[PDB]
């Protein structure tokens, strides 16, 4: 905001607070000087105290750019072999400032466009200037004359880089998602990488050739950083004329949109599943941040013989609104069941291969899958539709077995005991229904007051909890079959909640931007956090140690730990 | 990687040095004329004797080989070993050999060229050290035993894998395989570089230029399906068409006309792109046969344009240059030709340009319309422009003659345009 | 020739033998301080030793119909097969159809 921090290895080794209230906009270091330009066109130059020291510390001077000298400051650069010169490029022209004395030395001829980027070229005196039309100006500074002018039409230029490998290439990354490579000797365009980052999230926001390598690191705004190579030429004598196009090399990424549903994927607290509104299911890693693939939505070839009917334009699935995972049969058949927004069936997924499975699971009464659950043994998947029906599919062969018609509204929660003995469902008619499962009978039918919007089952104590619509959490023992606790105190809708790994707390995040920790034995709220941003998922670790939540804005997952 | 892979790269680095008598026998055994036994028998004095004789003959036929008689065919060039000199002298030696191959590309049906390049092959090792220019220069001769010998000698590059199938066999490589070889894309980048160097050194000839325009036409025909592969074939072939048109030889200009007409009937191009191509054609159009070919291709480009603003007027400078290169008697002979190639859109744009710009040759307009059967929308546009020109310019008897001609033929369309504008 | 001159830059005088970079920059084994213009000239030559100088600045400077029109048009545009015709014609052999 108003300060400049000087970190080494992550730790703030010095702070540099500026003497204004206007925010800092640009920042360029060179030599002993640090030049920080706050947004009202005034550049603060700080100096090293001792010429042996490691970072600038003391105030030195406060240059300023009035309106009659230039517009808003676009960038602050330094060129090589310029003693005490700071190249300040504004929206109208290019300036050179002597920083020790504090005296302007030169003002270029005003460009008839608006300048958006600057970049010092690896030759002497030359700076490249990207405008808001399609123009890259190669501008000299010893003379002050536009050496070259290269036109990209119908685009805004966002990031410029040069090559220093021994070839004279240029990379112009646009604000539309494109990245175009020029050869400056033949005045040619080698190539154009189309749509590497999303146009909707800024486009290409930085592109950098590494210093002497044929490797360009391009980062976008869609939570992704890539880097590409220039493979050497396939010819012998020609060489620089037959240039191979740039191929892919490494990259990291995440979610672009905020995440919708999270889930802890094993008991070690090693892996998280995270499905998000850009229709992507990722498998993040809580141990090492380079173990986190994206689960692949690449279908399997049918076992009947027909052809799978879809679009020939491949796409992603609809967004995920429920997930169930069970590690009991992993690496033998599928163990995730996911329920997508406004579709009439669920998908199986496989966490071993990190791929989709070969079965999809229908509801058979024209109803959307409103909730899903899996057996403990890993054999059965229960699909509760939006018309009451419970269909029970075998997961090895993905074949239908049963159907339970107790509800006539939607079924917002299913669970099975750890002994495969009893089975609870809860639905929007305010009804909890306790079925047997080894027989096929009904054991009981409880009716509460409000509708029921969520159910969480703790199998080690056989207690489940239902988030209602008179704004309360009803804790029901499943064996003796009655309400044992009724936690009151939320003031708006209850978004998400979960049990403690031992059965002692319920943590519930709700739409009044709060997260409350209720104690089950004594019955009262023992902790409350207020968040700046509403929390949409809360999941305890299967181990005791972590809490993982995720909010309305933000593309990540907040991790908390246990003082307890 | 693996030890065999790194050693493979080491071997291909030291591929040409004769570290032992067996490698020496093999390397000196590969030859263009003599077989294995006699090629392993003879020596550099023998080869250079034949070289100096054949180069005297080649300089007598075409007088540009005297410089190679000064440098590449001297006794110091008997003595010097290529594998010992530094990279700078290697580069200059490669420039000398590339210039020689560009000159003696056009003479390969000749035992003199065979003997001179025998000396180059068996002293400076061109057939493994720089085979790219060797194959590109002698690529148009592709049925001939000289190309068979070149193939049996050369270790083939990365890009010539089809010929890597055809190497050391009995049948020649076939035209479909040459179409494959050109149908790769990096090959086309390489070959257009070769032709740009060839034009800049000003030594092209009719056989090679025929061959390369035929391969280019077949490449466009093979990729007629993919709109995307055609769209990335655009800059290469239209850049070589630009350089081929900037050339001075009528042969190069006709070959560029051929590439232009086939590529613009295979891809529906932009209006500005078509007009820029027409501008370069007319701006360098000099000879008479090239004039005939250029009129044919301009008519074809203006026809294959199909879209919005299809038939609008030729702009100012383009119309000026076009009339200066084709005054009216030439286009009238072209129109009363009896082959009758379809050119109605170009004619209509021509008359609209005359109506806006010149405002004199309206009897010429009448003769054009008498010789051509235009279409209905073209007649409507001509009539509308003439109505505007009659309302602005002072009325003239030639304009009265034009409207009398319309009323004779197709008066009700004139009534419709007057109903749109006027009484 | 230049377009600006810096008086303090001619005024200044810098050491050399206090750092290893500038120790590379020295010329004689007896010189130990060098004024500003000779300093920046040596730095400029050292920059040339690191990054060699290219043709695209060494020779090129951007300063009757011509023959460069086709190259200029190809250099400007990036999509050749036009889509903004909207001709009320129909394109052959490639059908634009959607399922409903």
């Amino acid at each position: 905001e108003n300060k400049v921090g000087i970190y080494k290895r992550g730790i703030e080794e010095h702070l540099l607070e500026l003497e204004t209230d206007a925010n800092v906009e640009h920042l360029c270091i060179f030599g002993d000087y640090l030049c920080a330009s706050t947004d009202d066109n005034s550049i603060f130059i700080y100096k090293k105290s001792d010429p042996q020291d490691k970072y600038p510390s003391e105030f030195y001077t406060k240059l300023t750019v009035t309106e009659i000298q230039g517009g808003e400051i676009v960038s602050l650069q330094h060129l090589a072999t310029y003693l005490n010169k700071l190249t300040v490029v504004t929206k109208s022209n290019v300036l050179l400032f002597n920083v020790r004395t504090g005296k302007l030395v030169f003002t270029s001829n005003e460009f008839p466009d608006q300048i958006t980027t600057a970049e010092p070229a690896p030759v002497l005196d030359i700076i490249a200037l990207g405008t808001v039309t399609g123009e890259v100006i190669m501008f000299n500074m010893r003379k002050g004359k536009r050496i070259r002018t290269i036109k990209i039409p119908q685009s805004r230029i966002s990031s410029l880089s040069f090559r220093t490998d021994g070839s004279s290439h240029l990379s112009v990354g646009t604000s539309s998602g494109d990245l175009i490579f020029y050869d400056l000797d033949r005045r040619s365009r080698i190539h154009v990488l189309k749509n590497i980052h999303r146009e909707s999230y800024g486009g290409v926001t930085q592109a950098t050739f590494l210093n002497g390598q044929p490797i360009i690191v391009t980062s976008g705004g869609d939570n992704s950083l890539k880097e590409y190579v220039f493979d050497p030429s396939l010819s012998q004598g020609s060489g620089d004329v037959v240039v191979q196009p740039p191929r892919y090399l490494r990259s990291r990424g995440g979610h672009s949109q905020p995440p919708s549903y999270i889930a802890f994927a094993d008991s070690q607290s090693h892996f998280m599943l995270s499905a998000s509104k850009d229709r992507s299911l990722w498998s993040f890693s809580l141990r090492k941040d380079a173990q986190s693939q994206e689960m692949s939505q690449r279908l399997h070839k049918k076992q009947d013989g027909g052809r799978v009917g879809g679009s020939t334009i491949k796409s992603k699935f609809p967004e995920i609104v429920a997930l169930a995972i069970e590690n009991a049969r992993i690496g033998e058949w599928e163990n995730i069941i996911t329920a997508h927004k406004d579709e009439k069936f669920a998908r199986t997924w496989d966490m071993r291969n990190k791929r989709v499975g070969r079965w999809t699971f229908d509801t058979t009464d024209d109803g959307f899958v409103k909730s899903v659950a899996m057996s403990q043994c890993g054999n059965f998947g229960f699909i509760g539709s939006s018309n009451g029906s419970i269909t029970i599919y075998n997961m090895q062969s993905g074949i239908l077995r049963k159907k339970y018609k107790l509800h006539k509204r939607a079924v917002t929660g299913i669970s099975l005991d750890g002994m495969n003995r009893k089975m609870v469902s809860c639905g929007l008619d305010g009804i909890v229904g306790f079925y047997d499962f080894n027989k096929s009978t009904l054991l009981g039918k409880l009716k509460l007051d409000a509708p029921i919007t969520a159910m969480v089952y703790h199998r080690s104590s056989d207690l489940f909890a239902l988030a209602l619509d008179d704004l309360s959490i009803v804790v029901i023992d499943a064996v003796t079959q009655r309400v044992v606790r009724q936690l009151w105190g939320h003031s708006n809708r209850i978004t998400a909640f979960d049990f403690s790994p031992e059965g002692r707390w319920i943590v519930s995040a709700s739409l009044d931007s709060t997260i409350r920790t209720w104690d089950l034995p004594t019955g009262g709220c023992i902790d409350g956090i207020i968040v700046d941003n509403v929390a949409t998922n809360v999941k305890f670790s299967p181990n005791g140690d972590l809490l993982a939540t995720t909010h309305v804005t933000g593309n990540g997952i907040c991790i908390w730990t246990n003082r307890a | 990687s693996s030890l065999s892979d790194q050693l493979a790269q080491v071997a291909s680095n030291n591929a040409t040095v004769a570290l032992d008598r067996k490698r020496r026998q093999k390397l000196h055994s590969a030859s263009l004329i003599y077989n294995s036994k006699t090629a392993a028998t003879q020596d550099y004095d023998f080869i250079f004797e034949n070289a100096s004789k054949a180069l005297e003959e080649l300089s007598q036929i075409e007088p540009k080989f005297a410089i190679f008689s000064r440098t590449l065919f001297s006794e110091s060039s008997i003595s010097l070993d290529r594998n010992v000199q530094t990279k700078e002298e290697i580069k200059d030696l490669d420039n000398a050999i590339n210039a020689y191959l560009l000159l003696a590309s056009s003479k390969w049906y000749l035992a003199p060229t065979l003997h001179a390049t025998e000396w180059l092959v068996r002293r400076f090792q061109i057939h493994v050290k720089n085979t790219e220019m060797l194959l590109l220069s002698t690529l148009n001769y592709y049925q001939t035993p000289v190309f068979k010998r070149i193939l049996s000698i050369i270790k083939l590059p990365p890009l010539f894998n089809c010929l890597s199938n055809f190497v050391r066999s009995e049948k020649p490589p076939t035209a479909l395989t040459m179409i494959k070889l050109f149908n790769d894309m990096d090959f086309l980048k390489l070959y257009t570089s070769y032709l740009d160097q060839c034009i800049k050194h000003n030594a092209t000839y009719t056989n090679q230029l025929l061959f390369t325009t035929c391969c280019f036409i077949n490449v466009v025909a093979f990729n007629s399906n993919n709109d995307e592969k055609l769209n990335q074939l655009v800059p290469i072939l239209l850049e070589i068409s630009a350089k081929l048109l900037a050339s001075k030889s009528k042969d190069c200009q006709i070959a560029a006309h051929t590439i232009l007409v086939v590529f613009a009937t295979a891809l529906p191009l932009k209006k500005t792109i078509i007009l820029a191509a027409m501008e370069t054609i007319l701006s360098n159009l000099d000879a008479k046969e090239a004039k005939h070919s250029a009129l044919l291709t301009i008519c074809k480009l203006f026809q294959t344009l199909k879209g919005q603003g299809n038939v609008d007027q030729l702009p100012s400078k383009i119309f000026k240059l076009f009339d200066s290169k084709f005054d009216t008697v030439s286009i009238l002979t072209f129109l009363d030709k009896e082959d009758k190639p379809v050119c109605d859109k170009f004619i209509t744009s021509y008359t609209r340009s005359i109506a806006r710009y010149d405002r004199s040759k309206l009897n010429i307009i009448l003769s054009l319309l008498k010789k051509i059967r235009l279409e209905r929308y073209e007649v409507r546009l001509i009539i509308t422009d003439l109505i505007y020109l009659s309302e602005i310019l002072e009325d003239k008897s030639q304009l009265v003659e034009l409207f009398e001609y319309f009323i004779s033929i197709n008066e009700d369309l004139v009534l419709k345009c007057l109903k749109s504008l006027g009484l | 020739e230049a377009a600006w001159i810096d008086s303090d830059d001619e005024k200044i005088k810098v050491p050399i033998l206090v750092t290893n970079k500038t120790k590379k920059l020295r010329t004689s084994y007896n010189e130990s301080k060098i004024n500003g213009v000779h300093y920046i000239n040596r730095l400029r030559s050292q920059f040339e030793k690191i990054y060699p100088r290219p043709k695209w600045v060494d020779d090129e400077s951007d300063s009757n119909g011509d023959i460069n029109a086709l190259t200029k048009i190809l250099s400007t545009t990036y999509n050749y097969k036009d889509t903004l015709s909207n001709s009320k014609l129909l394109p052959p052999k490639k059908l634009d159809i959607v399922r409903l």
């Binding site: 270091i29 060179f30 030599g31 002993d32 000087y33 010429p51 330094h78 090589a80 072999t81 310029y82 003693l83 005490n84 020790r100 590494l210 210093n211 002497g212 390598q213 044929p214 490797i215 190579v229 493979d231 396939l234 191929r247 090399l249 | 990687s1 990365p158 890009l159 894998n161 089809c162 890597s164 199938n165 494959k180 790769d184 990096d186 090959f187 | 005024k11 200044i12 005088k13 810098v14 750092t19 970079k21 500038t22 920059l25 500003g36 300093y39 730095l43 920059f47 690191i50």
Partner: peptide
Amino acid sequence: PKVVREAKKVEMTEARAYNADADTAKAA
């Protein structure tokens, strides 16, 4: 056989750069 287009392992060679902390100098 078509042309074998096949990518080989890349290896970051050493770099050489510049130092603005020599480019800037103090007064007399």
